[PDB]
Write a protein that binds this ligand. Structure first.
Ligand SMILES: Cc1cc2nc3c(=O)[nH]c(=O)nc-3n(C[C@H](O)[C@H](O)[C@H](O)COP(=O)(O)OP(=O)(O)OC[C@H]3O[C@@H](n4cnc5c(N)ncnc54)[C@H](O)[C@@H]3O)c2cc1C
Ligand code: XAX
Ligand SMILES: Nc1nc2ncc(CO)nc2c(=O)[nH]1
Ligand code: FES
Ligand code: FES
Ligand SMILES: [Ba+2]
Lengths: 450, 760
């Protein structure tokens, strides 16, 4: 089982004997030592590498990326950012000018992230470089570098890779996968690999029976159904956020604070749902906006409201040989809001994740769709709080009066992220916040101007 | 070259990815890889230890117990012992019990978990009150220093403010984690490691192997950050490596995985500070009374000097006529806490900063004004002293703060926030100014020494070597600048060489911000010896006085004639004059008694101030720093650029300590925050949206290297202004005292909001 790919402008063919080996491992075993291991967990971006294909170019974490995934793609590492002749990237030079490096260990990751941003001409440096942790500089000099480099023309040698291409199961079509997974139910389906790769790197597990879904085009589609949007399980979080910009600015707002840019490029919506995490941020959003899930088993196809898929803690409504195929979101959801709470804003896991969605019959509450993450063992709606809210007036005092009922809906946990007290308080705090934001009051601290 | 904003010594090498770190260095095909087998109990005796499944595990070459160690089993920087491998008992969850040597890093980590260890558990001493209740402590009692009589002062104070608050610890999170490599080289070993103190590595490895010091050679080129976390925590790896290298006959490499790293190694000492501060009717301080309860962990490490510095900085920035500290260094069944940028300094200063803020609010005066009224007097019959009796005669704080407040627009903004606050009810803004007075030097006097070794080659080019280690602070760049300045040459001609115990022996740890300070001097000494030799030669050859020979801009000038530096050196070579010299410096004037808390521990103090502005969500506690303004005294800066960078970074790290970074242990002493997904250092957008840093540029009173000031640690304390601003935002929410605790997480902020609001 041999794969080929463009490594820093030069073609390379590789026999894959261990399907689970990360790209970071391979690069360093090759001597391409410029890619650093910072944590091997996704959070620090010290291993950021730049991949390219038909879809464009993006910066990803090398440590989460397993080899069979870069098959057919063009890969660019730090030691490939500078020109063949030796000339530095506008990004690299600017970083030397503006003192963007101190100890230098995170510099390779940043350069790669900035170069990819430079290639795609993207200037939202806060969200882009959130994935790259630095402990020395205080970030200020790196911003000066990024802005100074932005005025320069793109590296043409980096763009020359776009000419390219134009043991472990890798399906071509959705039907092909449905065939194989039906025969191999006990299999480890790897999509983005941003959860699965932590079982090998951290949990030191071994995965037999492996299949990579990130090579199925038809599974990674956003299509328009005459009732909403058919979003396949293969659609990446970044792409989902990209699409949501228009129809659902609330979801796009939330997905901005979903992981980092490097994780969002490869991590998928089907995997986020199929991980079945209580602190997952995909489900509560979609459950609040009334989205349905579609499961597939060969030629069989089940459909349901997303909240019903989640039965219990680490327990889902999944048959043997059944996989997550897609989700359907309605065309509009104007009353939707998304509240993610965590110690830090960027690149964090939610303590509480409030998702409120009310519709109004002019002053009075028609429908209550209020869903929470990190409040239970499963992402679920606030049944008693919702029921008590229907028929009431949409004003602070009424919502304030129903707040005790949330303490019947959930009995939250205490851990390193938050105490149960605070989690409970936050869920109640988000309800008052929803009424205030809808009444034109200033509520978001991130929106404040210096 | 000194004073030019020149770039870091490996700036291009960093940016290209060509800069080598330990795990990057190429080594022999047969290099073994090491991993520790860690304890799962907080306090137990080891009844049984079955390492059979560990040996059977694939790729494993050797497995080691404490019993398998030849000679010493100690890695403590203390006089007291701290085992590398556990000896019959365990003292915290994450203590190395055994050592695995496998053919791959992965294979060793896999094998490390395969052990079968049976424990006889004892009651653990996890919390401060427990340690205090069970008398679990170090030094056999609390260290107490008194200046004047607090008890009598506070009894007749016009305004009194008592209180107590927690200040959490801090994980260093240097991007390059702990790492070492041993190479057995004919009867002796060569160690490469990511360490701030290669001399102690040598000292430890030597005892570990039972070799004389001249048989252990440590080389260290660069760290991927250190922050104090690599001042002693490196010992364990280098010992394990040399021990395994000795036993297996082949090279051994060890690097902690990020999750091992946080579980094993120490952190910043988390303190509890109880305070009693008092002032008179005019607002001058009458007395301040402090008790420090410091968490040390299972082992001594560097707790003794850390808590000494917390006490030394308990005055903060202010003159207090009567002051007492009661410093309990408490032993707990947790990680052996260690050095961290500031070295207890921030902890003690914050105690003073919270108390003075409390007092300010308690009597209802603008904290800025009360702080201003109470600074040490400016230079120019008697100079004020610290509580430890050291004269403060370089205090610029009064003027500095006045400058900063003009440029930061302090009085206008503070009024603008007041109005904005009364427009909102969900959001609140806060602003605060925090001063920094930080003493420079090791409190352990004899460690205030550094050495250098300089070679001039016949082609004119120079090879520079000093005792200090590069962890990102631009130390090598500063020394190159100093060297090229003293010799009168272009800094291009000076090449820095990796830190080597065989080149410069008996070095101290690169700590106390004294790195550039003492090595600057040491380099200057070596260069002046060399410049002197060349000047003397030219003067003889040209017939005149040595002092009349000018060395400038790569040109030498004597008797109206002028040569290039290379021309003179080559000629001096031909003349048979040594082009090699050692340099050495010891900090003068330092003498103090630790036990009585009297004397002059510091050569000078470093000053600075920061004005921070923040927003808080009153519903959830969410918050961010909107604007920061810093005016820091770097003295006559060696490098303006490098220094601004240090301030920029140390601020963000100081603020991060008091905001989003939080260590959490479970009910069993298991560290729950042991990954970057649970420990949250400031991310890209966490930076001040308006970040203004300006150097207070005035030469140092004391004779330091080109009258610069140590800029490494002092700015870390500027992060206090962020915690003070966060408190100011909470105080804007109601009549009550907020009582904000450190760190000020969204949860901790919301608690302080609702206290001022008075909501149960
Ligand atoms: C640094 C970092 C930050 C993160 N931050 C967040 C966050 O903010 N919010 C959040 O919700 N999550 C976060 N996560 C975890 C999150 O669950 C994943 O990153 C991602 O959303 C899952 O998508 P994936 O394709 O990577 O899943 P994978 O890792 O590919 O798979 C996860 C699980 O789903 C299964 N699976 C995948 N695809 C399918 C399918 N099509 N059908 C059936 N089963 C499938 C796999 O077998 C596996 O059990 C973070 C992870 C990292 C490493
Ligand atoms: N980039 C970067 N800058 C840094 C550090 C770092 O790791 N990386 N660490 C410090 C510390 S922490 Mo201490 O006594 O050990 S507790 S000494 C010290 C320091 C070391 O450099 P001198 O000032 O001695 O030359 O500067 C700081 N600036
Ligand atoms: N920053 C700092 N580090 C130290 N390290 C070791 C020692 C040894 O006692 N002292 C100190 C000190 O006083 N300050
Ligand atoms: S190693 Fe930290 S993200 Fe890849
Ligand atoms: S520069 Fe030292 S970690 Fe980013
Ligand atoms: Ba540490």
């Amino acid at each position: 089982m041999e794969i080929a790919f463009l490594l820093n402008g030069e073609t390379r063919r590789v026999r894959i004997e261990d399907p689970t080996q990360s790209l970071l491992e391979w690069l360093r075993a090759e001597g391409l030592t410029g890619t650093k291991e910072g944590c091997n967990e996704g959070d620090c971006g010290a291993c950021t590498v730049m991949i390219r294909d038909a879809a464009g170019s993006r910066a990803v974490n090398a440590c989460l990326m397993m080899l069979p995934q870069i098959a057919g793609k063009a890969l660019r590492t730090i030691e490939g950012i500078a020109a063949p002749d030796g000339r530095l990237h506008p990004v690299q030079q600017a970083m030397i000018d503006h003192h963007g490096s101190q100890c230098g260990f995170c510099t390779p990751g940043f350069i790669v992230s900035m170069a990819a941003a430079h290639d795609r001409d993207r200037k939202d440096y806060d969200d882009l470089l959130a994935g790259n942790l630095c402990r020395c500089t205080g970030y200020a000099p790196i911003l000066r570098a990024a802005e100074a480099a932005a005025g320069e023309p793109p590296a043409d040698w980096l763009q020359a890779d776009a000419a390219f291409t134009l043991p472990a199961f890798l399906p071509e079509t959705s039907d092909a996968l449905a065939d194989w997974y039906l025969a191999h139910p006990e299999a480890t389906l790897i999509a983005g690999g941003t959860d699965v790769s932590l079982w090998v790197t951290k949990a030191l597990r071994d995965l037999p029976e492996v299949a990579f879904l990130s090579h199925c085009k038809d599974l990674a589609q956003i299509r328009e159904t005459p009732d909403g949007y058919g979003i396949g399980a293969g659609v990446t979080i970044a792409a989902l956020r990209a699409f949501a910009e228009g129809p659902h600015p609330a979801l796009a707002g939330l997905l901005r604070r979903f992981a980092s840019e490097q994780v969002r490029q490869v991590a998928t919506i089907g995997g986020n749902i199929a991980n079945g995490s209580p602190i997952g941020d995909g489900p509560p959003a979609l459950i609040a906006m009334g989205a349905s899930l579609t499961l597939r088993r060969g030629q069989e196809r089940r459909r349901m409201p997303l909240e019903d898929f989640f039965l219990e803690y680490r327990k889902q409504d999944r048959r043997p040989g059944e996989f997550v195929e897609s989700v359907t979101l309605p065309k509009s959801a104007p009353g939707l809001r998304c509240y993610k709470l965590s110690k830090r804003f960027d690149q964090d896991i939610s303590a509480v994740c409030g998702c409120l969605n009310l519709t109004l019959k002019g002053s009075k509450i028609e429908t209550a769709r209020i869903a929470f993450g990190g409040m239970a063992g499963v992402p679920k709606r606030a049944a008693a709080f919702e029921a008590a809210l229907i028929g009431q007036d949409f004003r602070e005092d009424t919502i304030a009066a129903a707040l005790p009922l949330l303490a019947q809906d959930f009995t939250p946990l205490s851990d390193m992220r938050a105490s149960a007290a605070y989690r409970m308080n936050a869920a109640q705090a988000m309800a008052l916040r929803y009424v205030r934001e809808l009444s034109g009051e200033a509520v978001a601290v991130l929106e404040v101007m210096p | 070259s000194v004073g030019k904003p020149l770039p870091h010594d490996s700036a291009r090498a960093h940016v290209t990815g060509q800069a080598r770190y330990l795990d990057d260095l190429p080594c022999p095909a047969n290099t073994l890889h090491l991993a520790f087998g860690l304890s799962t109990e907080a306090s137990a005796a080891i009844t049984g230890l079955d390492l059979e499944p560990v040996r059977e595990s694939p790729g494993v070459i050797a497995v080691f117990t404490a019993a398998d160690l030849p000679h010493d089993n100690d890695a403590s920087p203390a006089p007291s012992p701290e085992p590398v491998l556990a000896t019959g008992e365990v003292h915290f969850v994450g203590q190395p019990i055994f050592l695995v040597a496998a053919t791959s890093h992965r294979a060793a980590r896999i094998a490390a978990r395969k052990a079968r260890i049976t424990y006889a558990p004892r009651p653990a001493i996890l919390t401060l009150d427990q340690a205090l209740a069970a008398d679990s402590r170090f030094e056999g009692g609390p260290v107490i220093w008194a200046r004047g009589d607090v008890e009598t002062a506070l009894a007749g104070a016009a305004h009194l403010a008592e209180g107590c608050f927690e200040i959490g610890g801090q994980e260093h999170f240097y991007l390059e984690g702990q790492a070492a490599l041993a190479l057995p080289a004919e009867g002796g070993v060569v160690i490469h490691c990511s360490s701030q103190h290669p001399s102690e590595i040598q000292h430890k490895v030597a005892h570990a192997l039972g070799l004389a010091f001249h048989d252990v050679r440590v080389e260290m080129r660069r760290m991927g950050g250190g922050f104090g976390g690599k001042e002693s925590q490196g010992n364990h790896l280098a010992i394990a490596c040399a021990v395994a290298a000795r036993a297996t006959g082949r090279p051994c490499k060890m690097r902690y995985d990020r999750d091992d790293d946080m579980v094993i190694t120490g952190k910043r000492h988390d303190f509890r500070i109880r305070y009693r501060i008092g002032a008179d009717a005019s607002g001058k301080l009458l007395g301040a009374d402090f008790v420090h309860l410091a968490r040390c962990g299972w082992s001594a490490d560097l707790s003794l000097p850390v808590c000494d510095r917390a006490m030394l900085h308990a005055d903060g920035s202010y003159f207090v006529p009567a002051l007492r500290i009661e410093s309990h260094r408490l032993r707990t069944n947790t990680q052996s806490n260690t050095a961290f940028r500031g070295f207890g300094g921030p902890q003690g200063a914050l105690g003073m900063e919270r108390a003075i803020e409390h007092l300010a609010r308690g009597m209802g005066r603008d904290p800025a004004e009360l702080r201003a009224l109470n600074f040490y007097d400016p230079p120019e019959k008697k100079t004020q002293t610290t509580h430890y009796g050291q004269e403060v005669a370089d205090c610029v704080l009064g003027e500095l703060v006045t400058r900063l407040q003009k440029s930061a627009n302090f009085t206008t903004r503070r009024a603008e926030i007041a109005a904005w606050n009364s427009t909102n009810r969900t959001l609140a803004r806060g602003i605060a100014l925090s001063p920094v007075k930080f003493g420079i030097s090791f409190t352990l006097t004899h460690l205030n020494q550094a050495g250098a070794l300089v070679q001039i080659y016949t082609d004119g080019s120079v090879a520079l070597n000093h005792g200090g280690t590069e962890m990102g602070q631009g130390l090598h760049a500063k020394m190159v600048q100093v060297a090229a300045a003293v010799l009168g040459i272009d800094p291009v001609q000076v090449r820095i060489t990796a830190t080597d115990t065989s080149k410069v022996p008996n070095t101290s740890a690169t700590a106390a911000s004294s790195g550039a300070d003492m090595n600057g001097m040491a380099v200057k000494d070596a260069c002046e010896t060399l410049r002197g030799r060349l000047a003397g030669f030219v003067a003889a050859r040209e017939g005149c006085a040595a002092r009349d020979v000018i060395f400038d801009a790569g040109q030498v000038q004597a008797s109206g004639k002028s040569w290039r530096f290379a021309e003179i050196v080559a000629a001096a070579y031909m003349a048979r004059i040594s082009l090699s010299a050692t340099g050495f410096y010891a900090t003068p004037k330092l003498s103090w008694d630790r036990l009585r808390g009297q004397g002059r521990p510091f050569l000078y103090f470093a000053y600075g101030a920061a004005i921070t502005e923040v927003v808080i969500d009153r519903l959830t506690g969410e918050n961010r720093i909107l604007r920061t303004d810093i005016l820091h005294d770097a003295g006559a800066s060696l490098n303006p650029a490098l220094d601004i960078g240090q301030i920029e970074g140390a601020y963000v790290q100081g603020a991060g300590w008091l905001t989003t970074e939080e260590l959490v242990w479970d009910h069993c002493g298991r560290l729950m925050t042991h990954a970057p997904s649970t420990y949250k250092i400031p991310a890209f957008s966490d930076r001040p949206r308006i970040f203004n840093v300006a150097l207070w540029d005035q030469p140092n009173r004391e004779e330091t290297i080109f009258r610069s000031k140590a800029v490494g640690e002092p700015p870390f304390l500027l992060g206090i202004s962020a915690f003070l601003a966060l408190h100011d935002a909470c105080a804007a929410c109601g009549p009550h005292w907020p009582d904000l605790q450190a760190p000020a997480t969204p949860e901790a902020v919301l608690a302080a909001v609702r206290r001022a609001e008075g909501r149960a």
